[PDB]
Design a protein around this ligand. Structure first.
Ligand SMILES: CNCc1ccc2c(c1)c1ccccc1n2CCF
Ligand SMILES: [Zn+2]
Length: 195
C-alpha cells in the first residue's frame, strides 16, 4: 500500500551520493544535504551516485520510485499530470505516464506494478568504470512539482532500492525532490527557512 523509505545499507554498504553543484541562478540540478532534497529543472539530467563497500552479485539491480512525502497522500500513485502524460515526449522506452526516467541506458526497464499500480524504473547495477570509485545513474523528472492534476505542489520522495535478481531488498536510500524552474534560488530559500 505504501513502500518503505527506511534507510538500509545492507550487506554491501549501499548508499547514494550527490555532486556539489552550488546554487547559482543557472544551475539545473542541485542537492541540499541539510534538507536531504534534490532541486532540479524539468527533464534535466540529475546525476545520482551509487556507492557500495563491497561488490554485489551479478544480476543486482537498482530501482527508483517516487512517493508522496505527506502521509495523507502516500497511498496515491505519483504520476505525470494530465498535460505531460499527453505531450509526446517519449524516449521510446519510458511510458508517457512515468515521472522518473533513466537517461541513456538501453537496459532500463519500466514497471507498472500489477498490484499497487505504482511506477518504477530499474537498471542493472554496474561496477564503476576503471578509474572511478562509484557508478552514476542519470535520472530525469518529467513534471514540475507544481503541475496541476499531477503532483499539484505536493512534495515527493524518490526511493532508490538495491535489489537482487528476484527483486528482494538488498539496500535502500531516499531523498526529497522538488522539480522547479529555479533550483538554485529554491535551494537557497529552503535552506534559509530551515536555518
Ligand atoms: C572504490 N569504489 C567502490 C564502489 C562503489 C560503487 C560500486 C562498486 C564499488 C561496485 C562494484 C561492483 C558492482 C557495482 C558497484 N558499484 C555501484 C553500486 F554502488
Ligand atoms: Zn506535468
Amino acid at each position: 500500500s505504501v513502500p518503505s523509505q527506511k534507510t538500509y545499507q545492507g550487506s554491501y554498504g549501499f548508499r547514494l551520493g550527490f555532486l556539489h553543484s552550488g546554487t547559482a541562478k543557472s544551475v539545473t540540478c542541485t542537492y541540499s544535504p541539510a534538507l536531504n532534497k534534490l532541486f532540479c529543472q524539468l527533464a534535466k539530467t540529475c546525476p545520482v551516485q551509487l556507492w557500495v563497500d563491497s561488490t554485489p552479485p551479478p544480476g543486482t539491480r537498482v530501482r527508483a520510485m517516487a512517493i508522496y512525502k505527506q502521509s495523507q497522500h502516500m497511498t496515491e500513485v505519483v504520476r505525470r499530470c494530465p498535460h505531460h502524460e499527453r505531450c509526446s515526449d517519449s524516449d521510446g522506452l519510458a511510458p508517457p505516464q512515468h515521472l522518473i526516467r533513466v537517461e541513456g541506458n538501453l537496459r532500463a526497464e519500466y514497471l507498472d506494478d500489477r498490484n499497487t499500480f505504482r511506477h518504477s524504473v530499474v537498471v542493472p547495477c554496474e561496477p564503476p568504470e576503471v578509474g572511478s570509485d562509484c557508478t552514476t545513474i542519470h535520472y530525469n523528472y518529467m513534471c514540475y512539482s507544481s503541475c496541476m492534476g499531477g503532483m499539484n505542489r505536493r512534495p515527493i520522495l524518490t526511493i532508490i532500492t538495491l535489489e537482487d535478481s528476484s527483486g528482494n531488498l538488498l539496500g535502500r536510500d531516499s531523498f526529497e525532490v522538488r522539480v522547479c524552474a529555479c533550483p538554485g534560488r529554491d535551494r537557497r530559500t529552503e535552506e534559509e527557512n530551515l536555518r
